[PDB]
Coordinates of N, CA, C and O and ligand atoms in Angstrom, one line a residue:
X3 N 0.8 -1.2 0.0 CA 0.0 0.0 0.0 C 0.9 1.3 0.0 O 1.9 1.3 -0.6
X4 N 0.3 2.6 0.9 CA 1.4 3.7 1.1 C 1.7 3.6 2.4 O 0.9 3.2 3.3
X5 N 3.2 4.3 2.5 CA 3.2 4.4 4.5 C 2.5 5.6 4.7 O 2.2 6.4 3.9
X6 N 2.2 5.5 6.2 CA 0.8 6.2 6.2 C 1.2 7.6 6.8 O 2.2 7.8 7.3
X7 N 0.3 8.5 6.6 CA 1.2 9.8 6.4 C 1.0 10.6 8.2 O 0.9 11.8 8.4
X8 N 0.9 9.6 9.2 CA 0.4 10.2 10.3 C 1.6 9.9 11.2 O 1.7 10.2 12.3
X9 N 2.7 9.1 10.3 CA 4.2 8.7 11.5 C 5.2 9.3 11.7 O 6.0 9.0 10.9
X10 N 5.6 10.4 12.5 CA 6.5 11.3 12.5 C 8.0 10.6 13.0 O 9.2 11.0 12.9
X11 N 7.6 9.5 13.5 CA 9.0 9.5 14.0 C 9.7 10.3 15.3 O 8.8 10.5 16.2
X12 N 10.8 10.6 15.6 CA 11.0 11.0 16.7 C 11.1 12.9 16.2 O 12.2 13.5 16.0
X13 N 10.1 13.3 16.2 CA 10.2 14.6 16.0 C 9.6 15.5 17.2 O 8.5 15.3 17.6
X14 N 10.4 16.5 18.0 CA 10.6 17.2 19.0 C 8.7 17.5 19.7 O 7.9 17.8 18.8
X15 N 8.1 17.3 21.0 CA 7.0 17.8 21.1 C 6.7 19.1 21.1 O 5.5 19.3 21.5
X16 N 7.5 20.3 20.7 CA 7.4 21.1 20.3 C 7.1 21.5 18.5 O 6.4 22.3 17.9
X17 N 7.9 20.5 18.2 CA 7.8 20.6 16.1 C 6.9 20.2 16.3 O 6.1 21.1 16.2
X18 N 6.2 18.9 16.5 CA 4.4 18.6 17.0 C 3.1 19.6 16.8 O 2.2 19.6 16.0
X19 N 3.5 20.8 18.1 CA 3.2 21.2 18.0 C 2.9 22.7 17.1 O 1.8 23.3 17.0
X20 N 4.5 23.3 16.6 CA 4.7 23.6 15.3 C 3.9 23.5 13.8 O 3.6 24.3 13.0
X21 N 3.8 22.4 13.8 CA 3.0 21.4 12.6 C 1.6 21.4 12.5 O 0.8 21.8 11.6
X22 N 1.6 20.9 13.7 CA 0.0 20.9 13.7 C -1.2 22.4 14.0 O -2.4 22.4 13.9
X23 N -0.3 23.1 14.2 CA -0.7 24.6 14.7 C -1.2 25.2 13.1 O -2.2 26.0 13.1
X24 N -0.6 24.9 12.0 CA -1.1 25.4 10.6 C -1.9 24.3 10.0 O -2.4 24.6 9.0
X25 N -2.1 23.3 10.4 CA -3.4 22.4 9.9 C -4.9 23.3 10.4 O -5.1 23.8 11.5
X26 N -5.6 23.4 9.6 CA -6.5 23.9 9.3 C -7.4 23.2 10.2 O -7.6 23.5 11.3
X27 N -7.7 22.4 9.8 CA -8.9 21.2 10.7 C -8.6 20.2 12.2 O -7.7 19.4 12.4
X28 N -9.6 20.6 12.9 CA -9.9 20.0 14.4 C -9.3 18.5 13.9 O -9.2 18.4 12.7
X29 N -8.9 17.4 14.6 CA -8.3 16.1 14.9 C -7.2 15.9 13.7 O -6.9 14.7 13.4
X30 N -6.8 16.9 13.0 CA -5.2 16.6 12.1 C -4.4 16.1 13.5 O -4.2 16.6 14.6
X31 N -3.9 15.1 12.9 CA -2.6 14.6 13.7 C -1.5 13.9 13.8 O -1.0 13.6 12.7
X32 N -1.0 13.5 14.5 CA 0.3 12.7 14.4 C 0.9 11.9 15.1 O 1.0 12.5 16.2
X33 N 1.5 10.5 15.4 CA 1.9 9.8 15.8 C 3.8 10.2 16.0 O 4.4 10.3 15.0
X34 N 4.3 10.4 17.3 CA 5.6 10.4 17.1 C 6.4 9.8 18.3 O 5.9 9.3 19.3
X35 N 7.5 9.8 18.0 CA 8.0 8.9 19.3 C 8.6 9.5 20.8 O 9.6 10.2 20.6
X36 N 8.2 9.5 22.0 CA 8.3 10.9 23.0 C 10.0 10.7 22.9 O 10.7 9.8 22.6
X37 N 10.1 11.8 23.4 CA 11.9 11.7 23.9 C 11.9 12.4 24.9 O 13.0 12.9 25.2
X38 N 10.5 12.7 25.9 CA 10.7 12.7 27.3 C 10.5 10.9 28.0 O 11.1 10.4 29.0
X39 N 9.7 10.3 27.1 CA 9.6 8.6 27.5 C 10.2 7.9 26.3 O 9.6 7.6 25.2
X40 N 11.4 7.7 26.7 CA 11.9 6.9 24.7 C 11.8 5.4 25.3 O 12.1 4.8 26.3
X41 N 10.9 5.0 23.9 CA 10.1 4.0 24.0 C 9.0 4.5 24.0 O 8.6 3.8 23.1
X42 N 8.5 4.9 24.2 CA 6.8 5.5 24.3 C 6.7 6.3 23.0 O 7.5 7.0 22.3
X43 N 5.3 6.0 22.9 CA 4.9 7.0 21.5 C 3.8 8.0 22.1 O 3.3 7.9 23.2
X44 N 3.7 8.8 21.3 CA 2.4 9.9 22.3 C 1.9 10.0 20.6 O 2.4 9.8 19.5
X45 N 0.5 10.6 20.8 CA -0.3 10.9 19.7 C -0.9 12.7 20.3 O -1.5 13.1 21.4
X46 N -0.4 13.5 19.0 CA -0.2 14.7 19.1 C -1.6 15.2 17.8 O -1.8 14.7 16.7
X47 N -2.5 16.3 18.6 CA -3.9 16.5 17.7 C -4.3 17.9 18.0 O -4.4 18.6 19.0
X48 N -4.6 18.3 16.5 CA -4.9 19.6 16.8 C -6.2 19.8 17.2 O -7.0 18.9 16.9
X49 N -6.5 20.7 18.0 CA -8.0 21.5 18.6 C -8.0 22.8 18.5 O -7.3 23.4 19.4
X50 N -8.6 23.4 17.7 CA -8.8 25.4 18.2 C -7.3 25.5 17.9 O -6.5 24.9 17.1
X51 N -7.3 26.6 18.7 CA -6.1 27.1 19.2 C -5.0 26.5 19.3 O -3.9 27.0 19.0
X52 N -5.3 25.5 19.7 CA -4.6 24.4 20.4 C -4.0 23.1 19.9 O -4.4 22.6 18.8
X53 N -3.0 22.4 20.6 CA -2.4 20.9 20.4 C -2.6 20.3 21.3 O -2.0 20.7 22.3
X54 N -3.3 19.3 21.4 CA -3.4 18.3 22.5 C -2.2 16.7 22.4 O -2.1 15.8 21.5
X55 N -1.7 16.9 23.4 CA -0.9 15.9 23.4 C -1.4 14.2 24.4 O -1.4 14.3 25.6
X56 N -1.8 13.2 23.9 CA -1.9 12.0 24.6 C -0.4 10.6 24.9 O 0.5 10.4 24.2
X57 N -0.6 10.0 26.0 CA 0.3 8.9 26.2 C 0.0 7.7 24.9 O -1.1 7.3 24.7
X58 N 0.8 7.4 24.4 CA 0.2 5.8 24.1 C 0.3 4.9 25.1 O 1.5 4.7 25.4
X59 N -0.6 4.3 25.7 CA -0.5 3.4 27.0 C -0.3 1.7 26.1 O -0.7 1.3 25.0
X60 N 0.8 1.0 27.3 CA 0.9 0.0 27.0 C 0.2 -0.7 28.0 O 0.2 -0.2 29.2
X61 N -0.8 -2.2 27.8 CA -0.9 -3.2 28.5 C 0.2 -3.9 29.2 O 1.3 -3.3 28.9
X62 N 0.5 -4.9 29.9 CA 1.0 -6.7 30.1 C 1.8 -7.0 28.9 O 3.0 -7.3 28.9
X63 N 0.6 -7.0 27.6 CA 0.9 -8.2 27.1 C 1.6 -7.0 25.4 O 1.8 -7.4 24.3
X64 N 1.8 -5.6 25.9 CA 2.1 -4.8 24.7 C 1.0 -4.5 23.7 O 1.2 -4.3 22.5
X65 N -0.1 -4.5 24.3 CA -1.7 -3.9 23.3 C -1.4 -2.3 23.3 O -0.6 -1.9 24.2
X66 N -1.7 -1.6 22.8 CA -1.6 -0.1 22.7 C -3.2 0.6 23.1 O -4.3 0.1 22.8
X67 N -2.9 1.4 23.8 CA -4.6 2.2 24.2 C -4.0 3.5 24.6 O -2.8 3.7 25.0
X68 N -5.1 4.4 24.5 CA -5.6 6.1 24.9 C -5.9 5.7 26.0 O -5.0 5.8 26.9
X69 N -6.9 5.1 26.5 CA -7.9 5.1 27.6 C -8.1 4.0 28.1 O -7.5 3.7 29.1
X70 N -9.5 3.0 27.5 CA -9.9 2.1 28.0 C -9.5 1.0 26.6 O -8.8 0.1 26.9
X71 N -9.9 0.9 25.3 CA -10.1 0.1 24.4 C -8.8 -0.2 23.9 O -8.2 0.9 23.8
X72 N -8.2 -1.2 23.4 CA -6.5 -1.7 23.2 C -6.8 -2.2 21.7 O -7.8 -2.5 21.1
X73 N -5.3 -2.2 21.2 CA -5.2 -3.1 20.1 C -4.0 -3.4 20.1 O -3.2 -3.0 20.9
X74 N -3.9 -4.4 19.0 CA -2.7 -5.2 18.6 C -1.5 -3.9 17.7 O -0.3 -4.3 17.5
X75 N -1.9 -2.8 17.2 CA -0.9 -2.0 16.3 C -1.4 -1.0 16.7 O -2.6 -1.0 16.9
X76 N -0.7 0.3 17.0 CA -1.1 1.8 16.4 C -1.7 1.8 15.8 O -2.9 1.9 16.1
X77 N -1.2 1.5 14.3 CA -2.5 1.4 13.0 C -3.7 1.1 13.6 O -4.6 2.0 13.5
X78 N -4.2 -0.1 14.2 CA -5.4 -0.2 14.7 C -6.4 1.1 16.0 O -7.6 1.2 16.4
X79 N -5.3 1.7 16.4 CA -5.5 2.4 17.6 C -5.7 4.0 16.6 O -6.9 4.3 16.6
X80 N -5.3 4.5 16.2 CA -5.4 5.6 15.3 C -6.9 5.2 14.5 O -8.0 5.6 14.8
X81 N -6.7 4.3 13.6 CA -7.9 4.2 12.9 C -9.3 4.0 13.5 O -10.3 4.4 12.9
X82 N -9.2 3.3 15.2 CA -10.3 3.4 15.7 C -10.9 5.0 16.4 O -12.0 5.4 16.3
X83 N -10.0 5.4 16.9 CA -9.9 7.0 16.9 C -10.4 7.7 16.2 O -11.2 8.4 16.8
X84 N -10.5 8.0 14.4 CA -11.1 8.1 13.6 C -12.8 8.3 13.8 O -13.5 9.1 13.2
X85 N -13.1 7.5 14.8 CA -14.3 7.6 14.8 C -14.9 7.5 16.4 O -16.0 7.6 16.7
X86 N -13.5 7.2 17.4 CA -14.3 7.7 18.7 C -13.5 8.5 19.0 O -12.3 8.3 18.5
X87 N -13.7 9.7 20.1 CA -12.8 10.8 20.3 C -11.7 10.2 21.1 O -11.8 9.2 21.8
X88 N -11.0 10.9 21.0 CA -9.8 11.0 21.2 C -9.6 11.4 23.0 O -8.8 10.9 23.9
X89 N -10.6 12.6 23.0 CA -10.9 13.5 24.3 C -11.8 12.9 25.0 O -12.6 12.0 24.6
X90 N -11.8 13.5 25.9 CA -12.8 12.8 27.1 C -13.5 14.8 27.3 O -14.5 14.9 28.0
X91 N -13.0 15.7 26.7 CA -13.4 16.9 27.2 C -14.0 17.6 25.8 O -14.6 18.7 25.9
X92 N -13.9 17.1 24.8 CA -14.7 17.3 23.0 C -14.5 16.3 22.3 O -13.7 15.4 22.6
X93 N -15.2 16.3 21.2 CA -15.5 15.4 20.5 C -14.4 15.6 19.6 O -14.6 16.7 19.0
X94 N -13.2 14.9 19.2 CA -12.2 15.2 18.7 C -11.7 13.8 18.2 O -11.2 13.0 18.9
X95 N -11.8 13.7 16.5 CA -11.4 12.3 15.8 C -10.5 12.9 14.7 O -10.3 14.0 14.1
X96 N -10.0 11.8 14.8 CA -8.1 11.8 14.5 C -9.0 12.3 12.6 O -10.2 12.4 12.3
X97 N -7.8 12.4 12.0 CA -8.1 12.8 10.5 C -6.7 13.5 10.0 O -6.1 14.4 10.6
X98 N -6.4 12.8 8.7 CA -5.2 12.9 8.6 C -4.8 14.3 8.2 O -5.6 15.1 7.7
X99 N -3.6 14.5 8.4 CA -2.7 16.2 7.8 C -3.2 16.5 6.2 O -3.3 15.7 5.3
X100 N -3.4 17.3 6.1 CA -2.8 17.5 4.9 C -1.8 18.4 4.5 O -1.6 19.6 4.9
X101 N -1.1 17.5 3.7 CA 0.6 18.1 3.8 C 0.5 18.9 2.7 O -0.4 19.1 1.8
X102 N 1.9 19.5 2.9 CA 3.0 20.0 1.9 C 2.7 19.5 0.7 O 2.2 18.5 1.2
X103 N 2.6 19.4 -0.4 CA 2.7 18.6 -1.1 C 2.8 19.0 -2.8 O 3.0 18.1 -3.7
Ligands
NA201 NA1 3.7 3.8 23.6

């Protein structure tokens, strides 16, 4: 298929929020890898004004979850996002950048 255009890699949580600050639309976002927790990933989403930054939580057994519901990949954890919020404080679903291009 294509790689998917939501993986930043280890890019600063400031460039995060950099990036996402000129996306036009509520839930653009990005997956990147923290480098205050290396090993951990956080998922970074624009709102308003604003960038909201989340943990990626690990289970036991290495499932990924925001909150309560887990999966086996990111990919599955982003895509389910897509359509339940992200926030517990607005209704906020992931939707990809649109880049540079
Ligand atoms: Na993680």
């Amino acid at each position: 298929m294509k790689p998917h255009p939501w993986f930043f890699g280890k890019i600063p949580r400031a460039k995060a929020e950099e990036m996402l600050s000129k996306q036009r639309h509520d839930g653009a976002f990005l997956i990147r890898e923290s480098e205050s927790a290396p090993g951990d990933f956080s998922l970074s989403v624009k709102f308003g004004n604003d960038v909201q930054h989340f943990k990626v939580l690990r289970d036991g057994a290495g499932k990924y979850f925001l909150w309560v519901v887990k999966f086996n990949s990111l990919n599955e954890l982003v895509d389910y996002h897509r359509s339940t919020s992200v926030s517990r404080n607005q209704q906020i679903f992931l939707r990809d950048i649109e880049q540079v291009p």
